[PDB]
Amino acid sequence: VPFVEDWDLVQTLGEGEVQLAVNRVTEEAVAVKIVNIKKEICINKMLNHENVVKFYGHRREGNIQYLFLEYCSGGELFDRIEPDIGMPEPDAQRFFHQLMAGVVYLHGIGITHRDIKPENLLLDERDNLKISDFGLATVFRYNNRERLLNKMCGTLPYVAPELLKRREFHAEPVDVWSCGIVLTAMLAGELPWDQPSDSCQEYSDWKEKKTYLNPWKKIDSAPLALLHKILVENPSARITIPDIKKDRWYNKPLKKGAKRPRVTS
Ligand SMILES: COc1cc2c(cc1OC)-c1n[nH]c(-c3ccc(O)cc3)c1C2
Numbered sequence: 001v002p003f004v005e006d007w008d009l010v011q012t013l014g015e016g017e018v019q020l021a022v023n024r025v026t027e028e029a030v031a032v033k034i035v036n037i038k039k040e041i042c043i044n045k046m047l048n049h050e051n052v053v054k055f056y057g058h059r060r061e062g063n064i065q066y067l068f069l070e071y072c073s074g075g076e077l078f079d080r081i082e083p084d085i086g087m088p089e090p091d092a093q094r095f096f097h098q099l100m101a102g103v104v105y106l107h108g109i110g111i112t113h114r115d116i117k118p119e120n121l122l123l124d125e126r127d128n129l130k131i132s133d134f135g136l137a138t139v140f141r142y143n144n145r146e147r148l149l150n151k152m153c154g155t156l157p158y159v160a161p162e163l164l165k166r167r168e169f170h171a172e173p174v175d176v177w178s179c180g181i182v183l184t185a186m187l188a189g190e191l192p193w194d195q196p197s198d199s200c201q202e203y204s205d206w207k208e209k210k211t212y213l214n215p216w217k218k219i220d221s222a223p224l225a226l227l228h229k230i231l232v233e234n235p236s237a238r239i240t241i242p243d244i245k246k247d248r249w250y251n252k253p254l255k256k257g258a259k260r261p262r263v264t265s
Contacts, residue, residue, distance in 0.1 A: 020071060030056060033067035043134045046109060051102030053122060053132040072130055074123025081118055085189040090255030092186035098129035103175055104241050110141030112171035115154045116178035118185055140171035161196035162235045173235035180230030187223055188215030222249040
């Protein structure tokens with residue numbers, strides 16, 4: 001079948017750069033990443049899950065690497081968050097369920113993302129959350145042996161406090177913490193601190209349990225009981241994903257399914 005391997009770059013999705021590519025024959029839409037990268041390709045080749053951005057393949061034309069990835073027409077979770085407001089709680093709960101399914105998957109295969117934030121959480125046509133960008137990702141468990149991390153990476157507002165205080169740390173509690181910062185952004189439409197350090201007034205207020213202040217003031221007591229268990233400074237006392245799935249707000253019926261077509265009489 002001629003020309004089925006030809007793609008047209010029709011618009012920039014993000015900045016290397018990510019372009020929306022449309023197949024000349026089929027009109028199938030994919031996102032093409034134009035660019036460390038050797039590790040990114042190898043990690044993406046291991047991934048196959050409904051809440052992880054699909055990897056179709058890669059091609060190298062000289063010095064330029066072309067990564068063929070899933071186009072998520074719903075865009076970023078970031079653009080669903082209304083500044084200083086957030087989003088309806090049943091939406092945030094459904095996105096948080098999906099974020100956990102993805103993170104459970106990655107952790108089960110011994111991969112840590114290390115930069116979870118709403119800019120990286122994409123949405124497909126049915127608003128299904130997909131984790132993206134494996135550029136900072138790494139193997140923390142191999143041959144059933146865990147290796148402690150020491151490399152400082154991520155984005156300061158989403159980084160766990162042990163990354164700024166300790167030489168070495170477990171990988172899984174770091175991704176749990178960032179998921180708790182994402183949940184805060186979804187329910188309050190604002191980040192609680194610039195970084196999780198004692199020098200940060202907002203961070204000290206949280207540790208002092210001053211939940212009468214923002215963003216905690218905008219969050220209902222049931223999701224806020226969950227954020228109290230996630231945003232725990234000691235990563236050994238911090239809630240794990242198996243225990244998150246047992247949380248009351250996490251199991252609270254709130255959201256109806258996607259409205260199906262209906263007629264009366
Ligand atoms: C800013 O808006 C968007 C951004 C983006 C998309 C779609 C958007 O709007 C529909 C999209 N699909 N796949 C990807 C994407 C896929 C893999 C990756 O590593 C990085 C980005 C993006 C970014």
